[PDB]
Symmetry: C2
Subunit: 51 residues, 2 copies
């Protein structure tokens, strides 16, 4: 055994190399949405036509 001392754990070094790049299937902050402006309640829609 050893004393897992206060000053012992060094800061974990992150890898270095090229910059990290996004891989999400859909962007998250920069996206925006073209509203429909509140259709009726009985009118169902096959989604293409609403789009």
């Amino acid at each position: 055994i050893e004393p897992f001392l206060k000053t012992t754990p060094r800061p974990i070094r992150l890898p270095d190399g090229p910059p990290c790049f996004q891989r999400s299937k859909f962007l998250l902050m920069d996206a925006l949405k073209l509203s429909i402006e509140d259709p009726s309640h009985e009118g169902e829609g096959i989604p293409l036509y609403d789009a």
Copy 2:
């Protein structure tokens, strides 16, 4: 000539026979309308689907 006197013109006699019957292409007082409840302004509709 003759004097078209005040008392001369008898009341025109309407014909007599069976009762008069409607022939309009669409009834007029008794009809009613199933509303759509105010759709949007951009959504055009081929009329069957609105009906």
